[PDB]
Ligand binder design. Structure first.
Ligand code: K
Ligand code: MG
Ligand code: MG
Ligand code: MG
Ligand code: MG
Length: 222
RNA sequence: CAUGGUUGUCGUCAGCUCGUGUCGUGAGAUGUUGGGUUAAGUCCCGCAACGAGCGCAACCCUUAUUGUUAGUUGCCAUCAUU
């Protein structure tokens, strides 16, 4: 990836000076107009490392979970994960999604079962009220679990956009010892993430850029 | 004031809990809280919670209109008689 690509995407922007994290000074270039500037040179080195790391994971057939509920990142992570054939969570991370994976499988089973009933034809013999409710049930399960409906096992790697926003997701990864590759901003904590990617969390183009690079790494590994 | 069974009572009030997960050294907590909404823990939304159970509601009886099958021991409009 190119430094010009990053600059055009606006990756270099950070959050306000006051809201930074001191641990991020390792990756900060300078502060302009009261906002910190990520060092895009370190960004290039680190994005290359993460691309290689994601490639290594894919070469083992490992499962990748693309997580982001930021308004900017939700749609982008969905598309890239689908394109890479890996699973995504873009709306809201349910507590216990992984640590309570056993319980979640029952909601996934509910979602699969309700889909079959429609195709099966049970919906035709349903007394209106029932079919209405069942549709509503599905709409929510798809809304929450839809992106990981078919995930076979706990992910081997978790990609996270704005871990500070995705607080619960980072915690579950730590509990299960799942390495994390995250778009880290000036206000985030790098110590939590195995693979640090210094990049603005608040730029749609930047989020899509980095997510596409990770998705492409996975595809290439496969 | 050894008990089973039966019953009163708060009160037909909307509550009482459990599984898994998570938080807390621990008793415990979370969910069951919050914004709305409802008669309702009723429902929606949000939420480290996701579900479930006993409740709530519904399924039940009766009452309020009516189609149809039946037409006596019931009914009498159409008819004639008492
Ligand atoms: K519990
Ligand atoms: Mg209570
Ligand atoms: Mg209830
Ligand atoms: Mg809630
Ligand atoms: Mg009842």
């Amino acid at each position: 990836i190119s430094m010009k690509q990053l600059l055009e995407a606006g990756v270099h922007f950070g959050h306000q000076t006051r809201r930074w994290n001191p641990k991020m000074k390792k990756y900060i270039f300078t502060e302009r107009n009261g906002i910190y500037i990520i060092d895009l040179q370190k960004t290039v080195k680190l994005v290359d490392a993460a691309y290689d790391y994601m490639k290594n994971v894919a070469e083992e057939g490992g499962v990748a979970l693309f997580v982001g509920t930021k308004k900017q990142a939700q749609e982008a992570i969905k598309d890239e994960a689908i394109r890479a054939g890996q699973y995504y969570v873009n709306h809201r991370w349910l507590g216990g999604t992984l640590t309570n994976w056993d319980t979640i499988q029952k909601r996934i089973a509910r979602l699969k079962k309700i889909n079959a009933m429609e195709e099966d034809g049970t919906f035709e013999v349903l007394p209106k009220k029932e079919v209405a409710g069942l549709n509503k049930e599905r709409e929510r399960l798809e809304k929450f679990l839809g992106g990981i409906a078919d995930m076979p096992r706990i992910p081997d790697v978790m990609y996270i956009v704005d871990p500070r926003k995705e607080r619960i997701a980072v915690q579950e990864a730590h509990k299960l010892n799942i390495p994390i590759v995250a778009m880290v901003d000036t206000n985030c904590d790098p110590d939590e993430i195995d693979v640090v990617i210094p990049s603005n969390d608040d730029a749609i183009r930047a989020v899509k850029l980095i997510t596409a690079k990770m998705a492409d790494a996975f595809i290439e590994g496969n």
